[PDB]
Amino acid sequence: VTMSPESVVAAAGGGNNNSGYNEPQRFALVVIAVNHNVIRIMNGSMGFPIL
Amino acid sequence: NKTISVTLGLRHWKTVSAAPPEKMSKSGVCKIATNVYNRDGGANPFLVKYE
């Protein structure tokens, strides 16, 4: 991922009053993934054929 | 193409009939070995009728 000039200038503080970035700003990248799975039910119980 | 890493097909997940059929809250057994501290014997009961 490539960052942005707005973020690199907001990382340093010094903004005027009610600007939101009056203090140094921190950022954290998060990644979420959605996948597929199979559930098997037999003899009154469940199991994971692939886990 | 390039070499692909082997995908271990570990499944297991047989689970376990941990949940009893309804609650199966019944495992009945009785004290057998005459408790402990078997205490005294006949303790000479006898009779008190004035012969």
From TrEMBL, chain A:
Per its UniProt entry, which superkingdom is the organism in?
Viruses
Where is this gene product found?
Virion
> So what family is this one in?
Belongs to the NCLDV major capsid protein family.
This chain belongs to which protein, by name?
Answer: Major capsid protein
Organism (species): Singapore grouper iridovirus
- From which residue to which, out of the full length, is covered? 413 to 463 of 463
TrEMBL record, chain B:
Q: Under what name is this protein listed?
A: Uncharacterized protein
Which taxonomic lineage does the organism of this UniProt entry have?
Viruses, Varidnaviria, Bamfordvirae, Nucleocytoviricota, Megaviricetes
| Shown part of the complete sequence | 309 to 359 of 461
